[PDB]
């Protein structure tokens, strides 16, 4: 059978050749090579069909290799980020460089869930006791920091404050008004009180004493 399929392919017309290749495959290294060659002649739909024929690391590897030479594959990479629930989640975001702005909004579901796990893993008398005892002497932030360049609201900014401290300082500096001659970061009534307290706690955690 396959001799006729290969002979037909010599005449080629990419879609007909792909159909003949599928027929030959039905009755997989050679078939994968042929599909890759047809895509090289073309091609994203062929990769999607390859993923459908698959159903796992080799699939995502081929997705990343093809992505370098490249929109549903972005959905596939974001779904892999969902499967990271994990550095490929950031790698998928790097591949989203191609509305135009909707590429950030796929990440906060994973970002909020990561914020649940990592901060959770991290009494009147004892609060003073422990504080007295002390006197004897990061990728998650960057996800939120990238979004908050362009994000719409403070309901996002609430989640950033749960993480870290230099990044939290560094972005809030753009939301705190300057002093007229010192350039000091003053609090504002445009921010709500809890976020001001978070920034205060940032300066306290970094030990930036005079600024605090």
């Amino acid at each position: 059978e396959d001799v006729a399929f290969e002979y037909e392919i010599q005449k080629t017309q990419n879609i007909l050749t792909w159909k003949r290749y599928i027929e030959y495959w039905k009755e997989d290294k050679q078939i994968r090579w042929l599909y890759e060659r047809f895509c090289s002649q073309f091609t994203s739909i062929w990769e999607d069909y390859i993923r459908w024929e698959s159903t796992t690391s080799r699939i995502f590897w081929l997705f990343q290799r093809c992505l370098k030479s490249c929109d549903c594959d972005r959905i596939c990479l974001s779904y892999l980020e969902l499967a990271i629930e994990l550095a490929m989640i950031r790698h998928a975001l790097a591949s989203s460089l191609m509305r135009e702005m909707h590429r950030k909004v796929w990440d906060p579901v994973i970002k909020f869930v990561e914020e649940k796990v990592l901060p959770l893993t991290q009494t009147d008398e004892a609060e003073l006791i422990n504080v007295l005892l002390v006197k004897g002497f990061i990728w998650s932030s960057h996800i939120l920091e990238r979004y908050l360049k362009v994000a719409p609201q403070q309901k996002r900014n609430e989640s950033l404050a749960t993480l870290d401290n230099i990044t939290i300082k560094s972005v809030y500096e753009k939301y705190l008004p300057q002093d007229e001659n010192s350039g000091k970061y003053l609090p504002s009534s445009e921010l709500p009180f809890e976020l001001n307290f978070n920034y205060l706690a940032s300066l306290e955690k970094l030990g930036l004493d005079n600024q605090y």
Partner: protein
């Protein structure tokens, strides 16, 4: 929706963080037609 991220990208210690977070990821044409020519030569060559 502001689209101010034009011509820029996301910014390592975060690589080390992601290396630790692996537990967090679990806790939750010419190369063929030549051959065809040779095969056809083989089929013809007997006669």
């Amino acid at each position: 929706x502001x689209x101010x991220x034009x011509x820029x990208x996301x910014x390592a210690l975060t690589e080390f963080e992601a290396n630790w977070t692996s537990i967090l990821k679990a806790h939750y044409l010419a190369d063929m037609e030549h051959w065809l020519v040779q095969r056809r030569k083989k089929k013809l060559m007997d006669e």
